[PDB]
């Protein structure tokens, strides 16, 4: 408790001693509350007029309009201590997968020049004053000083400045300094691809969106049950005290320096909490805990993917009978336990797809269904079902949902095979709507539209309306202009090359899933989805509004080639059938 969180609570105490004062009508239950002190401050969600100008027939569609307008009572909840059975299945499990992911890696610590670099071509790092931007206190020593006396203070087993900021979501700011030493000692399993599937067998880390399909279809031809995804009920606020002392344990395979900055990291900023939150009644509430998720986006995931993968190799084990109660582990179900690790563990990861809090699991046979008491006792409590009703599993990889989206199998008029993703139509043109932040100029908006009409043309080109607007917008934006995004799965349509150039690259080159290496000649070649299919997923094909702006699209293109004024343009629109004469 107060003894490593209490120069944390000291320090911000002094810099508002004129306005401290212990809050007696405080509403945290599970949060330990320090104090409080004087505040005055809050960024909603703006609209892209390019992508809104060559979208018109969305504009009276409530699911797509809604999007752009606008629990902390899961937040302060509390998690159970897991049963001793439990606890010692999560240990064997997290000791032997951390062995399996550290096989062919190796532990290292992430440089200035590194994190220096990543600052510098815009990552979503969530710092918060001295500098006005994280690219300013990266090209000044004075920063890299207040980084080195934390440093030298974390070597020493303390910490003076590592504290969150808040704001089913939750992102912990931090400042920058905090980041680069969180960075420096658990960048490497983001950085050195320790969740790629090569590595982990169960993680897609690095796998792009045009490759989720095919490694679903890869775990659908093994021979067993359902394919189960069920998704967890705020997975970050049900972490356990247990789960994050088995995330510690990847220290064990470090050494020097390294191995005792990363567990400063774990036991000073993961293990204990300190964090400052506005409250209305504006005071700034100074508040602490041990468990639950509290890291960097980044490093939030690796660890994500770790206890997830762990849980479900749990709930494999538990469905295949290898232990008999959670109660308790007898010294010969701890055997059996390692060896079913050691024969059997690398074949049941591959059973397995895991995005961070997201699975897919395809068990030996559907025992799995009604396996819940590890589950439900880690505190990984499944999402809208009851507690003890058994999981309704997927009999066709094609129904199955997985990071937001499903997949489907389409054949080229020349049958080849594409696994391509899909989600519902609305989805993605209400996003594609929406910009974050202030002071976009109109190339800069402009950009942002280019960026997601080459996202639709590589990822979503089977959606008839979205290649159609994808091809509207690459008309109407010059043709030159760089695609921008201010938030950066790879990115291959961040790009100036020609998309069917890209295309190529992406979906025949370079998939290992596709033998006939012939290259692709025109857009025509590239299928859509079946009529009925596209109207299913969300397509407006069938409707008089898309019939009138499919025909009159030309006229929305010089609408927004007039906007943005006399610069060079392409036309797109003859790559496709109907405006090719
Ligand atoms: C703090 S983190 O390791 O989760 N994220 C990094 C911060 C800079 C680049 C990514
Ligand atoms: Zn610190
Ligand atoms: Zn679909």
Redesign the pocket.
Known sequence: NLDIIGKRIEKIKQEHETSWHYDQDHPYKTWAYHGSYETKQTASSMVNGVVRLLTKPWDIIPMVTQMAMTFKEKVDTRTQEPKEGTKKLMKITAEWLWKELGKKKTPRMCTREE?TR??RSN?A?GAINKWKSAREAVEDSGFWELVDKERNLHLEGKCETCVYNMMSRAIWYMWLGA?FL??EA??FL?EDHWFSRENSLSGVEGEGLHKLGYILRDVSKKEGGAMYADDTAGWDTRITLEDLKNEEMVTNHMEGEHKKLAEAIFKLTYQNKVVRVQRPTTVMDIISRRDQRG??????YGLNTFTNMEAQLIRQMEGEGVFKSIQHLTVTEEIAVKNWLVRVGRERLSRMAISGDDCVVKPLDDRFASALTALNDMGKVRKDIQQWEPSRGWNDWTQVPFCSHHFHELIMKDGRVLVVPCRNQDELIGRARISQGAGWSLRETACLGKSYAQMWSLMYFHRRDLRLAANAICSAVPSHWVPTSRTTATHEWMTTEDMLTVWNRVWIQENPWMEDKTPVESWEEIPYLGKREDQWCGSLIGLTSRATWAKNIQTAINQVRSLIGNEEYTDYMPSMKRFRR
Do not use: H, I
């Open positions: 994190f990543k600052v990552a790092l980041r969180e960075f658990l960048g983001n890291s960097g986006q980044v490093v939030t």
